[PDB]
Amino acid sequence: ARANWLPGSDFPAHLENCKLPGCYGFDPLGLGANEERLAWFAESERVHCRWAMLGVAGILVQEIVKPDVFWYTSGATVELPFDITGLLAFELFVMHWVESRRGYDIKKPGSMDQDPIFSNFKLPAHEPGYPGGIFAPFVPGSLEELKVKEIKNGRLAMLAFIGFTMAAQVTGKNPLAALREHLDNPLGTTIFSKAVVVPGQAVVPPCAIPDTIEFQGITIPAGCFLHSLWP
Amino acid sequence: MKDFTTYLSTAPVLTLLSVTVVAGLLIEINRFFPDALIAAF
Amino acid sequence: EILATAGLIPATPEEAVWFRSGVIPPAGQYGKYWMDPYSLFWIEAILMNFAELKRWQDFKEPGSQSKQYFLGLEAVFGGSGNPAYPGGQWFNMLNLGKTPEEMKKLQTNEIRNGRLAMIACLGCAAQGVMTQKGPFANLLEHLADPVSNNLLGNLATILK
C-alpha cells in the first residue's frame, strides 16, 4: 500500500495513521506502544538524527581538509588552543543549559519559549521538537516533506556514523580511506572476506586502535569497543 | 503442603528438629571455641 | 553374523556376534562406532524415554497424544481402542488387514512369530553362554555333526 519498511506487511497498532514524519510501520519490539514514551522516543530520535548528521559531516570535512589526521584519535591528538578541562567544563555548563531547556520543552511545550534576558523575544507556539522561528530562518517549500527529508537523512547519518566507527575500529583508517581501500579491491576488503566463523575455527580481523592511549599523563582505556563478540 | 507443614509442626518433629539445631549450634560453638572452661571476656 | 559369514560386510564373524557388539564390554567390544557406547546409551535413553512415555500415556488415556503439538507428528498418534494396535497413518502405513478376519489372522501371525522369536532370543542367550559362538555358527556346527555338537555333547566345554 503506502510506504512501508516491509512492503506487503501492515502497520502495527501504535503506528496506525502516524503524525510523526518518517513513519514506515517499524517498531517490531513495540517500544513506542506507550503514548508519552513514543513522544520521548521521537525527540530522542530527532536529536540523534541531528547530532549524527553533524558528526558525519564533521568527520567528512575534517578528512577532506586534513587527510593525515585520524578522527577516532582526533580527541587526543589535535593540539587544542585551550586547556581541555576548562573546555569540557564550559561545554558541560552550556550544553546542560540548552539540553535542560529542550527537555523541559518536551515535558511541557508552553513553558519556556521566552528569552530569560529580553521579554520581547519569545518563540511562537510550535509542535514539540520543532522550535522554528529564530531557529528556522529559511524554509525551502512546505514543512512536512522537508521534515521527512530531515528525518530520513538523520537515519542515514546514524547508520553512517556507526559504519564510520566500525571502519575505524576494523581498518584503523579513515572511512573515506576505507572507501578507497574497498573500491580498488572489492572482493577481499569485505568483512565477509576477512571475518568467517565456522564450527571449528573463528577468524577475527585484528584490532588496530591501541588498547591504552596516553593523553596528558593519564591513560584512557580506549580499546576497540569489545572484542570476543567480533565475527 | 498445608498438611505436610502441619505434620512438620507436630510436637515430635518440632522437638527433634529443635534439639538437632540446638545441638548442632552448640557443637559448632565448641568446634570454633573449644575448651571454654570459664566465661572470660 | 549371516552377513559376515557370507563376507558381504568387512567384519570378522567372531566379531559380528551379537553379544560382542559392545552390549556387554566384558563379553566383547566394538570400538569402531562413531561414539563410545555410553554416549549412544545416553541418546538412546532420551529417545526411548520420549517414545515409551508417549506410549505409556496413550495406554493410560486411549485418546490422548494427538491433542498436544509435537511438530505436527501428533496426527498419527490417535491410536485405536486396543493399546497394542494403534495402526494410524504411520503404524499401519500400508493399510493391511482391511477386513476384520484378515486383521485377526495377521494378528495371530504376528503373535506366533513373536513368541517364536522370544524363544529364539532366550535360546541365543543360552547358546552364547553355552558355546561362546554366534547362533549361526552354532547352527552350522550342529548341522556338521548333530550327534557330537548338541547340548549334552557341549556340556564339558561351556565357558572356555
Binding site: G188, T190, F192, S193, V203 | - | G72, L73, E74, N95
Partner: protein
Amino acid sequence: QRKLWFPGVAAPGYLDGSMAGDRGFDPMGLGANPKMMTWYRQAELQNGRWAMLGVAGILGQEIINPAQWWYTAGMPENLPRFDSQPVNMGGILAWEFILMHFVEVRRWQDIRKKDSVNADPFNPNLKVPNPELGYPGGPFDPLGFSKGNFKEAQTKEIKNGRLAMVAFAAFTIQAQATGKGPLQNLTDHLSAPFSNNWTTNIGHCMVPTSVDVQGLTIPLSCLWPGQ
C-alpha cells in the same frame, strides 16, 4: 487422486487429490494442519526446483568439464578465473548473501500474505500475476508456457522436483561413497557391476577429514559414519 503411492494405502482426508502431486502419502501426518501444509508445499517447491538446478548443473558440468569433480568444485583453486580480481570466498558469499536475502525475504512476505509483494517497488502499476502461492509468473513466466493446461504441468514440475531431490541425495551419497562423479559411477557400473555397486563402495568415506580454504578450516562430513 486415482492411483496412490501404495496399492492398498488409504488416502488422508486432507489429501483429496485437489492440488498437484497428490498420491495419498504423508505417513508422518505433517500435512494435517492446512497452514503448515501450505508451508510444506512451499518448501517442497523450493527444494525441488533447487534440486533440479543442482542436478542439471552436476550433469552438465560432468558432460562439459569431466576433469572437475562436482564435490570439490567449490574449492577456490578449482574456481575458473574470468578476470584479474583476486579470489576471496567471502567476496562471493557477500554477493549471494545480499541478493538471495532480498529475493527470499520477498518470497517470504509473499508466503505470509497471499498477494502481498506483487508490485514493483518503484512503480506500483505493473505487477506479477500469481494464481496461487509459490507460482509468481509474469517475468518469471515470459515465454507463456502456462495459461492453458496448468494442473498437469504443475504435477510434471512437482514430480520432476521429487525426482531431482532423490537424484541429488543419490549424487551426495555416491560422491561420499565412491569419490567419483555420478555419470562416471554409471559408466563404472556398466563395466564391472559385480564389484562397482553399493556393496563394498558403502562403508568408505572418500571425503577428506577436513579442508583448508585460504586459511579457514572446514571440518566436513560424509552423511553416514563409515570409513
